[PDB]
Amino acid sequence: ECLGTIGPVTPLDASDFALDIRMPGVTPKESDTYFCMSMRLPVDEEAFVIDFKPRASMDTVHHMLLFGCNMPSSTGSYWFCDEGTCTDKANILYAWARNAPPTRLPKGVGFRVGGETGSKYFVLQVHYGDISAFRDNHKDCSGVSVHLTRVPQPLIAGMYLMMSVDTVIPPGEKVVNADISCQYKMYPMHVFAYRVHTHHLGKVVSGYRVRNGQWTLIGRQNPQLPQAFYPVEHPVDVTFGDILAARCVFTGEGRTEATHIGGTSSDEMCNLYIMYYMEAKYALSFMTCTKNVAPDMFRTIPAEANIPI
Numbered sequence: 001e002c003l004g005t006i007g008p009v010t011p012l013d014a015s016d017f018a019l020d021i022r023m024p025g026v027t028p029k030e031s032d033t034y035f036c037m038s039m040r041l042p043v044d045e046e047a048f049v050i051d052f053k054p055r056a057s058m059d060t061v062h063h064m065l066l067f068g069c070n071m072p073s074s075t076g077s078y079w080f081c082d083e084g085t086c087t088d089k090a091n092i093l094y095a096w097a098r099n100a101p102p103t104r105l106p107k108g109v110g111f112r113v114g115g116e117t118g119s120k121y122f123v124l125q126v127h128y129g130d131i132s133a134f135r136d137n138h139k140d141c142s143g144v145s146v147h148l149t150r151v152p153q154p155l156i157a158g159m160y161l162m163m164s165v166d167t168v169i170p171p172g173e174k175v176v177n178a179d180i181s182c183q184y185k186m187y188p189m190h191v192f193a194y195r196v197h198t199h200h201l202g203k204v205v206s207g208y209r210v211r212n213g214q215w216t217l218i219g220r221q222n223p224q225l226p227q228a229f230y231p232v233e234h235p236v237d238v239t240f241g242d243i244l245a246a247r248c249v250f251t252g253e254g255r256t257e258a259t260h261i262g263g264t265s266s267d268e269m270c271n272l273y274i275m276y277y278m279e280a281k282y283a284l285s286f287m288t289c290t291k292n293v294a295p296d297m298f299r300t301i302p303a304e305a306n307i308p309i
């Protein structure tokens with residue numbers, strides 16, 4: 001339901017408030033439409049996102065993503081996310097999927113936003129399935145209600161993003177692996193959730209911690225399943241010295257030409273989002289690995305990584 005006269009900010013008490021990030025009453029025209037809109041933070045000072053409540057129409061919406069960045073891709077009420085999400089790095093905060101339980105942030109854990117260094121904008125992206133539901137010209141206000149607090153949290157949430165850049169998938173080629181590997185060189189993080197992302201050619205995605213050549217599974221998923229954040233079975237600590245490794249398995253069957261990494265639907269991606277927390281005084285909010293520093297290491301990758309559901 002659209003807010004109107006009350007607007008998007010609800011004070012929860014002296015130092016907390018709910019921020020409602022909603023579509024400005026939109027009516028799509030085709031199936032598989034991707035809409036985006038941004039909101040600036042109401043506070044300039046630092047703040048912590050400690051909760052997320054999904055406000056989606058159970059019929060219309062397929063998935064929703066929420067990002068933090070400093071330069072949203074465009075001005076304007078809303079836009080097609082083909083124009084982009086953010087010009088700077090979009091830091092994914094939250095994913096809601098239809099047939100997938102979003103899991104809560106553990107208590108005492110929050111994303112750091114605002115201030116001199118934190119994100120100054122939220123970007124919401126809403127993916128609409130069919131318009132068999134808005135066959136009455138409904139304007140839509142779906143989105144996410146975010147819980148913000150100025151109370152510094154004992155543990156800070158973050159994102160370790162593994163992504164391929166150089167993958168090339170030859171047409172009809174049965175199996176192409178994209179491998180990603182960096183060494184972890186920060187204070188300890190604890191992984192509590194993961195999301196995988198791939199386009200139509202991805203069969204399986206897997207992320208491991210490697211410690212003295214010992215593969216410890218973080219997350220393994222079919223990227224053709226809803227792309228939510230799934231919780232980690234057993235919270236996995238990654239510590240200075242470990243190596244994070246990831247593998248996407250691809251096929252080029254049904255393809256006339258080669259497929260590479262890129263933005264469009266006819267391109268591919270190999271993205272594993274590892275959501276972690278750290279002790280506040282050690283914490284950083286985002287790390288990225290785009291290299292493959294131990295290609296020879298992948299010879300001892302568990303078989304599971306090569307076989308799908």
Ligand SMILES: O=N[O-]
Pocket residue numbers: 188237
């Ligand atoms: O961080 N090892 O429990």
Ligand SMILES: O=N[O-]
Pocket residue numbers: 262263264265269
């Ligand atoms: O999912 N399009 O990058």
Ligand SMILES: [Cu+2]
Pocket residue numbers: 062063064127
């Ligand atoms: Cu979707």
Ligand SMILES: [Cu+2]
Pocket residue numbers: 197198199263268269
């Ligand atoms: Cu993509």
Ligand code: NI
Pocket residue numbers: 190237
């Ligand atoms: Ni631990």
